[PDB]
Amino acid sequence: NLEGDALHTLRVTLVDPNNVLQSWDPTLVNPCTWFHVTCNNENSVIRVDLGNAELSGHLVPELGVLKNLQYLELYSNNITGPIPSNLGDLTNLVSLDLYLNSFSGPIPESLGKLSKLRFLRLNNNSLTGSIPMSLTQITTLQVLDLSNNRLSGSVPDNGSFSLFTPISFANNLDLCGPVTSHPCPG
Ligand SMILES: *[C@@H]1O[C@H](CO[C@@H]2O[C@@H](C)[C@@H](O)[C@@H](O)[C@@H]2O)[C@@H](O[C@@H]2O[C@H](CO)[C@@H](O[C@@H]3O[C@H](CO)[C@@H](O)[C@H](O)[C@@H]3O)[C@H](O)[C@H]2NC(C)=O)[C@H](O)[C@H]1NC(C)=O
Ligand SMILES: *[C@@H]1O[C@H](CO)[C@@H](O)[C@H](O)[C@H]1NC(C)=O
Ligand SMILES: *[C@@H]1O[C@H](CO)[C@@H](O)[C@H](O)[C@H]1NC(C)=O
Predict the structure, then answer these.
(1) Residues enclosing ligand 1, CB less than 6 A?
(2) Going by CA atoms, what residue is nearest to atom 2 of ligand 1?
(3) Phi, psi angle pair for 29, to nearest 5°
(4) CATH number at residue 34
(5) Residue 95: enclosing H or E segment and its boundaries?
(6) Residue 55 is part of which domain span?
(7) In what order do the strands lie in the sheet with 150-154?
(8) Cα(65) to centroid of ligand 2, in Å?
(9) What's the 156 CA to ligand 1 centre distance in angstroms?
(10) Whole-number Å distance between alpha carbons of 119 and 160
(11) Residue 35: other Cβ atoms inside 10 A
(12) Could you give the dihedral angle defined by the CA atoms of residues 166, 162, 182 and 155, in that order, rounded to the nearest 10 degrees?
């Protein structure tokens, strides 16, 4: 059970004072009966729903083996560290909700590979660096929130970013461009 091993590895590295993940018993045939985990009819994980679960610690790159994952709902916790650089491995993701956490480092360029993504909500973290241009390749994007981070540099208004307005980018370190409220000096 590769998927269960990956999720158990996540449990080890997350900090879970309330033992929300107590049921995450890797001796089971699969993780489909675990609390907060949902599988499809083929017993493959499609949702991890851990919003507002009083978790901290960091994520793990083993998340990338959850090939059928559609929802990664980890918002409103105190998770730290970087967004794993390989989250773009999760090509069936339709929602990536990491908002209201303590993530730092850059937005991974690999997120541009998430060609089915509808929700990308990373607001209210401590993310730094520039927004990857690869994100404009995500033609399905409908809800984007990168506000309240420490992002800097130019933001394009092309591809799917043409859909969004300054509220999606507000209160960063030094963003500029047509979709933001400040033109780029160059
Ligand atoms: C860690 O995350 C919490 C919020 O997350 C919530 O509480 C955790 C303990 C876990 O149970 C999470 O699962 C849960 O979603 C942050 O605490 C919150 O801090 C904010 C301030 O940044 C407080 O918000 C408000 O402040 C404004 C005034 O500016 C008003 O709207 C409100 O009156 C409120 O005070 C909020 O109260 C507070 N929440 C709790 C439960 O303490 C915490 O700061 C964060 N850690 C870090 C380092 O960011
Ligand atoms: C997001 O962060 C900003 C800080 O710039 C804060 O004003 C706002 O209340 C935060 N949102 C939530 C839901 O805590
Ligand atoms: C949008 O324009 C930027 C800058 O030229 C480019 O890097 C990116 O690939 C473009 N995306 C699309 C979908 O055209």
Answers:
(1) 52-54, 76-78, 102
(2) 78
(3) -55, -35
(4) 3.80.10.10
(5) strand 95-97
(6) 1-186
(7) 80-81, 102-105, 126-129, 150-154, 174-176
(8) 33
(9) 32
(10) 12
(11) 12
(12) 110
